[PDB]
Design a protein around this motif. Structure first.
Motif, PDB file in Angstrom:
ATOM      1  N   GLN A 155       0.836  -1.189   0.000  1.00 35.22           N
ATOM      2  CA  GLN A 155       0.000   0.000   0.000  1.00 35.22           C
ATOM      3  C   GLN A 155       0.880   1.251   0.000  1.00 35.22           C
ATOM      4  O   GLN A 155       1.895   1.290   0.709  1.00 35.22           O
ATOM      5  CB  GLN A 155      -0.929  -0.001   1.218  1.00 35.22           C
ATOM      6  N   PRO A 156       0.531   2.286  -0.769  1.00 35.24           N
ATOM      7  CA  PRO A 156       1.393   3.480  -0.805  1.00 35.24           C
ATOM      8  C   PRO A 156       1.584   4.134   0.551  1.00 35.24           C
ATOM      9  O   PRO A 156       2.600   4.806   0.767  1.00 35.24           O
ATOM     10  CB  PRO A 156       0.657   4.413  -1.778  1.00 35.24           C
ATOM     11  N   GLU A 157       0.636   3.958   1.474  1.00 30.67           N
ATOM     12  CA  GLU A 157       0.716   4.648   2.757  1.00 30.67           C
ATOM     13  C   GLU A 157       1.947   4.219   3.547  1.00 30.67           C
ATOM     14  O   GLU A 157       2.527   5.023   4.288  1.00 30.67           O
ATOM     15  CB  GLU A 157      -0.554   4.391   3.570  1.00 30.67           C
ATOM     16  N   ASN A 158       2.361   2.962   3.407  1.00 29.25           N
ATOM     17  CA  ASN A 158       3.464   2.421   4.192  1.00 29.25           C
ATOM     18  C   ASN A 158       4.828   2.609   3.540  1.00 29.25           C
ATOM     19  O   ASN A 158       5.824   2.134   4.095  1.00 29.25           O
ATOM     20  CB  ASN A 158       3.234   0.932   4.464  1.00 29.25           C
TER      21      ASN A 158
ATOM     22  N   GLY B 262       6.566  -0.591   8.028  1.00 29.55           N
ATOM     23  CA  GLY B 262       6.577   0.042   6.723  1.00 29.55           C
ATOM     24  C   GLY B 262       7.827  -0.269   5.928  1.00 29.55           C
ATOM     25  O   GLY B 262       8.553  -1.216   6.243  1.00 29.55           O
ATOM     26  N   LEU B 263       8.087   0.526   4.893  1.00 31.76           N
ATOM     27  CA  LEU B 263       9.218   0.314   4.002  1.00 31.76           C
ATOM     28  C   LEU B 263       9.951   1.629   3.793  1.00 31.76           C
ATOM     29  O   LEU B 263       9.319   2.680   3.647  1.00 31.76           O
ATOM     30  CB  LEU B 263       8.756  -0.253   2.657  1.00 31.76           C
ATOM     31  N   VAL B 264      11.280   1.567   3.785  1.00 32.25           N
ATOM     32  CA  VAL B 264      12.131   2.722   3.518  1.00 32.25           C
ATOM     33  C   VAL B 264      13.018   2.387   2.328  1.00 32.25           C
ATOM     34  O   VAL B 264      13.746   1.387   2.349  1.00 32.25           O
ATOM     35  CB  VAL B 264      12.977   3.102   4.740  1.00 32.25           C
ATOM     36  N   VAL B 265      12.961   3.220   1.296  1.00 31.92           N
ATOM     37  CA  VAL B 265      13.836   3.103   0.136  1.00 31.92           C
ATOM     38  C   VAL B 265      14.686   4.367   0.108  1.00 31.92           C
ATOM     39  O   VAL B 265      14.192   5.463  -0.176  1.00 31.92           O
ATOM     40  CB  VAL B 265      13.048   2.904  -1.166  1.00 31.92           C
ATOM     41  N   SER B 266      15.969   4.217   0.416  1.00 29.36           N
ATOM     42  CA  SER B 266      16.901   5.331   0.531  1.00 29.36           C
ATOM     43  C   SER B 266      18.151   5.031  -0.295  1.00 29.36           C
ATOM     44  O   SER B 266      18.191   4.078  -1.080  1.00 29.36           O
ATOM     45  CB  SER B 266      17.240   5.589   2.000  1.00 29.36           C
ATOM     46  N   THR B 267      19.177   5.859  -0.115  1.00 28.34           N
ATOM     47  CA  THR B 267      20.424   5.729  -0.851  1.00 28.34           C
ATOM     48  C   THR B 267      21.601   5.779   0.114  1.00 28.34           C
ATOM     49  O   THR B 267      21.497   6.285   1.234  1.00 28.34           O
ATOM     50  CB  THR B 267      20.568   6.830  -1.915  1.00 28.34           C
ATOM     51  N   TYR B 268      22.733   5.236  -0.343  1.00 31.10           N
ATOM     52  CA  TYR B 268      23.917   5.165   0.507  1.00 31.10           C
ATOM     53  C   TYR B 268      24.385   6.554   0.920  1.00 31.10           C
ATOM     54  O   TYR B 268      24.746   6.775   2.082  1.00 31.10           O
ATOM     55  CB  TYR B 268      25.037   4.423  -0.220  1.00 31.10           C
ATOM     56  N   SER B 269      24.388   7.503  -0.018  1.00 30.35           N
ATOM     57  CA  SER B 269      24.850   8.850   0.300  1.00 30.35           C
ATOM     58  C   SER B 269      24.009   9.485   1.400  1.00 30.35           C
ATOM     59  O   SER B 269      24.520  10.293   2.183  1.00 30.35           O
ATOM     60  CB  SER B 269      24.823   9.720  -0.956  1.00 30.35           C
ATOM     61  N   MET B 270      22.726   9.134   1.476  1.00 27.22           N
ATOM     62  CA  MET B 270      21.836   9.665   2.499  1.00 27.22           C
ATOM     63  C   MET B 270      21.846   8.842   3.779  1.00 27.22           C
ATOM     64  O   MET B 270      21.224   9.255   4.765  1.00 27.22           O
ATOM     65  CB  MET B 270      20.404   9.738   1.961  1.00 27.22           C
ATOM     66  N   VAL B 271      22.529   7.700   3.792  1.00 27.52           N
ATOM     67  CA  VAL B 271      22.573   6.844   4.970  1.00 27.52           C
ATOM     68  C   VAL B 271      23.990   6.606   5.475  1.00 27.52           C
ATOM     69  O   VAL B 271      24.162   6.319   6.672  1.00 27.52           O
ATOM     70  CB  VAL B 271      21.877   5.495   4.690  1.00 27.52           C
ATOM     71  N   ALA B 272      25.011   6.719   4.628  1.00 26.45           N
ATOM     72  CA  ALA B 272      26.389   6.468   5.024  1.00 26.45           C
ATOM     73  C   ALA B 272      27.114   7.724   5.491  1.00 26.45           C
ATOM     74  O   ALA B 272      28.269   7.631   5.918  1.00 26.45           O
ATOM     75  CB  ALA B 272      27.162   5.837   3.862  1.00 26.45           C
ATOM     76  N   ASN B 273      26.473   8.888   5.424  1.00 24.39           N
ATOM     77  CA  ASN B 273      27.123  10.120   5.844  1.00 24.39           C
ATOM     78  C   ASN B 273      27.361  10.111   7.349  1.00 24.39           C
ATOM     79  O   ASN B 273      26.555   9.594   8.128  1.00 24.39           O
ATOM     80  CB  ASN B 273      26.275  11.330   5.454  1.00 24.39           C
ATOM     81  N   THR B 274      28.487  10.695   7.756  1.00 23.04           N
ATOM     82  CA  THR B 274      28.924  10.666   9.147  1.00 23.04           C
ATOM     83  C   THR B 274      29.036  12.051   9.764  1.00 23.04           C
ATOM     84  O   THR B 274      28.559  12.262  10.886  1.00 23.04           O
ATOM     85  CB  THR B 274      30.280   9.947   9.255  1.00 23.04           C
ATOM     86  N   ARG B 275      29.653  13.005   9.067  1.00 25.65           N
ATOM     87  CA  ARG B 275      30.023  14.267   9.701  1.00 25.65           C
ATOM     88  C   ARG B 275      28.844  15.231   9.789  1.00 25.65           C
ATOM     89  O   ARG B 275      28.411  15.598  10.887  1.00 25.65           O
ATOM     90  CB  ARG B 275      31.184  14.911   8.936  1.00 25.65           C
ATOM     91  N   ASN B 276      28.309  15.648   8.645  1.00 27.11           N
ATOM     92  CA  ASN B 276      27.342  16.744   8.578  1.00 27.11           C
ATOM     93  C   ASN B 276      26.007  16.222   8.054  1.00 27.11           C
ATOM     94  O   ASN B 276      25.861  15.933   6.864  1.00 27.11           O
ATOM     95  CB  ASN B 276      27.879  17.881   7.701  1.00 27.11           C
ATOM     96  N   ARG B 277      25.035  16.104   8.953  1.00 26.11           N
ATOM     97  CA  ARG B 277      23.653  15.823   8.595  1.00 26.11           C
ATOM     98  C   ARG B 277      22.765  16.986   9.014  1.00 26.11           C
ATOM     99  O   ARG B 277      22.900  17.532  10.112  1.00 26.11           O
ATOM    100  CB  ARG B 277      23.159  14.532   9.256  1.00 26.11           C
ATOM    101  N   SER B 278      21.848  17.361   8.126  1.00 22.03           N
ATOM    102  CA  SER B 278      20.948  18.468   8.397  1.00 22.03           C
ATOM    103  C   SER B 278      19.925  18.076   9.460  1.00 22.03           C
ATOM    104  O   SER B 278      19.742  16.900   9.788  1.00 22.03           O
ATOM    105  CB  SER B 278      20.239  18.905   7.116  1.00 22.03           C
ATOM    106  N   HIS B 279      19.251  19.090  10.008  1.00 21.54           N
ATOM    107  CA  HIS B 279      18.224  18.831  11.012  1.00 21.54           C
ATOM    108  C   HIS B 279      17.095  17.986  10.438  1.00 21.54           C
ATOM    109  O   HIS B 279      16.603  17.065  11.099  1.00 21.54           O
ATOM    110  CB  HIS B 279      17.679  20.150  11.557  1.00 21.54           C
ATOM    111  N   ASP B 280      16.673  18.283   9.207  1.00 19.57           N
ATOM    112  CA  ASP B 280      15.612  17.499   8.584  1.00 19.57           C
ATOM    113  C   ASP B 280      16.040  16.054   8.364  1.00 19.57           C
ATOM    114  O   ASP B 280      15.222  15.138   8.514  1.00 19.57           O
ATOM    115  CB  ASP B 280      15.203  18.137   7.257  1.00 19.57           C
TER     116      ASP B 280
END
Length: 211
Positions: A9-12, A29-47
């Motif tokens: 279902q799209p909701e999940n 639910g399900l999360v489809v992300s990318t390495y650049s958005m998950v492997a970062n260490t130093r600087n992550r934004s508040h969002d």
DNA sequence: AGCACGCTGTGTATATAATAGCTATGGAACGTTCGGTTGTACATA
């Protein structure tokens, strides 16, 4: 693809990319992300920091590493440790890398379960047949002379832009377009890519392009 | 020729019949003229 092939279902489903970062609040639910958005260490934004904590807090049940030939890199492999999961799967058409880090996959995600031949699926109609070719465009006399004197790093731009290559690409493009074919022209060098595109009046894509 | 006086017509009041022609006086309508740069990965020499 996930939506189309199964009854997810799209909701999940939540897509954690640079554009949208909302996460599913439903129990499972399900999360489809990318390495650049998950492997970062130093600087992550508040969002992007709340989402990462949301990923880390829960104990996931399955991870799908698409293009797993890049997970043994210096930093991408960190995600395999941070994310908690009881099952890990790797999907890649090619399982090769220049360095010796390919074998590192054994203790990161496990062994190689299955492999499939290319010609076997080709003759069964599952993938297309390709007539691979290698065109020899002899460098024109004028360009070639400079290739001797110039250094290694500039010599590349020199033998990528020889006019004969322009003529061969232009002839093949016209010939196959008349055959009602959809052509893709790859080029790792961006300057040549733009020069070819603006010369032939065709759209082009490269790294600076908004999604 | 102007003034005093006599004679004569006009108006006002009343009734009444006849007739045709104009006037009010309400009622209804229509036409004209005013208020992008940084920093970190990644893949390869």
């Amino acid at each position: 693809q996930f939506l189309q092939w199964c009854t997810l279902q799209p909701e999940n489903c939540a897509v954690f990319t640079s554009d949208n970062k909302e996460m599913f609040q439903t129990e499972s639910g399900l999360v489809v992300s990318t390495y650049s958005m998950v492997a970062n260490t130093r600087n992550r934004s508040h969002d992007s920091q709340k989402v990462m904590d949301f990923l880390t807090g829960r104990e996931w049940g399955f991870i799908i590493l698409d293009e797993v030939h890049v997970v043994p890199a210096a930093m991408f492999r960190r995600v395999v440790s941070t994310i908690a999961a009881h099952a890990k799967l790797g999907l890649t058409a090619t399982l090769v890398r220049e360095d010796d880090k390919i074998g590192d996959l054994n203790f990161l995600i496990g062994p190689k379960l299955y492999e499939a031949n290319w010609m076997e699926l080709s003759q069964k109609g599952h993938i297309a047949n390709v007539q691979c070719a290698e065109v020899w465009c002899p460098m024109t006399a004028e360009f070639y002379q400079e290739y001797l004197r110039e250094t290694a790093r500039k010599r590349m731009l020199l033998y990528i832009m020889n006019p004969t290559k322009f003529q061969a690409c232009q002839f093949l493009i016209q010939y196959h377009e008349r055959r009602g074919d959809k052509i893709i022209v790859f080029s790792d060098n961006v300057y040549a890519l733009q020069e070819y595109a603006l010369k032939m009046g065709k759209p082009f894509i490269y790294g600076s392009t908004p999604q």
